[model samples]
Target: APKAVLVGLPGSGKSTIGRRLAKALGVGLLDTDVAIEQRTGRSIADIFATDGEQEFRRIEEDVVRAALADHDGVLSLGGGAVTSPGVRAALAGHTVVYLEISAAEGVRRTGGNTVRPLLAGPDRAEKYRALMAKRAPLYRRVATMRVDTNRRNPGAVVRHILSRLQV
Candidate 1:
């Protein structure tokens, strides 16, 4: 029963905005990616490397499902979590906020971040655009509200989310 659940692509500032939103609401923030890392005792990059994307996603789906059911604070989901039907189904009736970011901005924000498995290697901007193309609709489908993070500060984004959610 989270107060809010964040869904978006990488570099969408889910962790950053989740922190402010949780503080404003006097609640904790449970980031599902962090949860997976903690549960597996491995970084997400390592998980993707050793377990592969398929296995990592399986773990992500389980972690996200549990978090949605038990967490009473704000929740931040991994960028690709919504691609799983189970995760999308679990999001029903929750206040899901999609932090929308442009491909250029996303690439810029995540630049040189070798930890993000999907965005690693060359042509990251192209990869980001392709990722958005495939996932944007899914994010839209699952979100109760959408906030454009392009050219917006974390404080402004949090305030917008708070006002929209009326928290």
Candidate 2:
């Protein structure tokens, strides 16, 4: 079985928490973004810049599906991966975790990160809120657990998820 899959907004800390969680569980960590970069031999920023977000999303959808199918370790997904119906459908029955964070907190955590294509506009805070609002339901719909990262540390969030999984 796949160990777990993390889905959330830009600053939800999926990759960071996934690494620690995977290490704690003694499993490999597979990030779909990294996989896509390796698959295409290009960074996500480059792909978005050259091919457009739609094209990047198409690749992301395929990559996420493949990772879920092939990986037996912790999988961390991109923020927008859930926007694709295919990726959302693919998450069914998996141990999906939603790393919930508010828009303000998301902005706080994601500040100084230049790689987020969606949050690149002048109205970044509004953009973050709008996107999070749109995607929150999908996240909740597929998630087996939801952990708020508002003021919590990575260790606390991981512990909470582990405890929930035990039930």
lDDT string, candidate 1, 50-166, tens digits: 889889988999999898889999999988888888888989999899999988789878886555645455576787789999999999999899999999999999988888876
Clashing residue pairs for model 2: none
User: Which candidate comes out best when scored by lDDT?
Assistant: 1
Model 1 steric clash pairs: none
Which number leads on TM-score?
1
Query: For residues 122-145, what per-residue lDDT tens digits would candidate 2 score against the true structure?
Result: 587887889988998889988988
RMSD of each: 4.0, 4.1
TM-score per model over all chains: 0.88, 0.87
Model 1 TM-score? 0.88
